[PDB]
């Protein structure tokens, strides 16, 4: 819900996520950027870090 909220229609995404009580597995690139953790790409892959 974090990536979709930051993309577009933040109100609709946030309210539907709140209704559905969605949990965001911080596994994406945009989300890891938002929380300020290493992006799972490039020199962030578990192999390389």
């Amino acid at each position: 819900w974090l990536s979709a909220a930051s993309f577009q229609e933040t109100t609709r995404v946030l309210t539907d996520a709140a209704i559905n009580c969605r949990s965001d597995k911080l596994n994406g690139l945009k989300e890891n950027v938002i929380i300020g953790k290493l992006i799972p790409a490039g020199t962030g892959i578990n192999r390389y870090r």
Partner: protein, 147 residues
């Protein structure tokens, strides 16, 4: 029925209750995230949030006094309507009816607006950032440089 089931199953499956749509309390954002700037000359600018919070608090106190002192159900219902409109403006101003406008007929930035648009938090403060150790000048061609 399918469109309705999409919303009903959401509450059915989880332990959350649909009673969260109706509020008995309203949270107040921390002040440092809605500060007032005391420019020289007493020119204290209050964020749009503080104005709406004041509207809601005023109407809540009004309705509280009217119930405590007793009043005809018509007046109390009218005050509850005004409180409902004030809270609706606070959460999402301009969605229903005429936006609550401040000085110079401009709609106020509600809580819903801090999270929307290119100016909202998501696309302004989270994705893009401002960074130290950075500068900017005009570029000119240096032909004696190396790649």
């Amino acid at each position: 029925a399918l469109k309705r089931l999409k919303v009903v199953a959401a509450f059915q499956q989880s332990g959350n209750s649909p009673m969260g749509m109706v509020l008995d309390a309203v949270p107040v954002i921390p002040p440092e995230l809605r500060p007032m700037v005391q420019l020289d000359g007493g020119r204290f600018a209050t964020s749009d949030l503080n104005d709406l919070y004041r509207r809601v608090i005023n109407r809540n106190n009004r309705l509280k006094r009217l119930i405590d002192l007793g009043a005809p159900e018509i007046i109390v219902n009218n005050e509850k309507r005004m409180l409902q409109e004030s809270v609706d403006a606070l959460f999402d101003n301009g969605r229903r009816g005429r936006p609550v406008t401040g000085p110079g007929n401009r709609p106020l930035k509600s809580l819903s607006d801090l999270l929307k648009g290119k100016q909202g938090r998501f696309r302004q403060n989270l994705l893009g950032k401002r960074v130290d150790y950075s500068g900017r000048s005009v570029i000119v061609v240096g032909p004696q440089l190396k790649l």
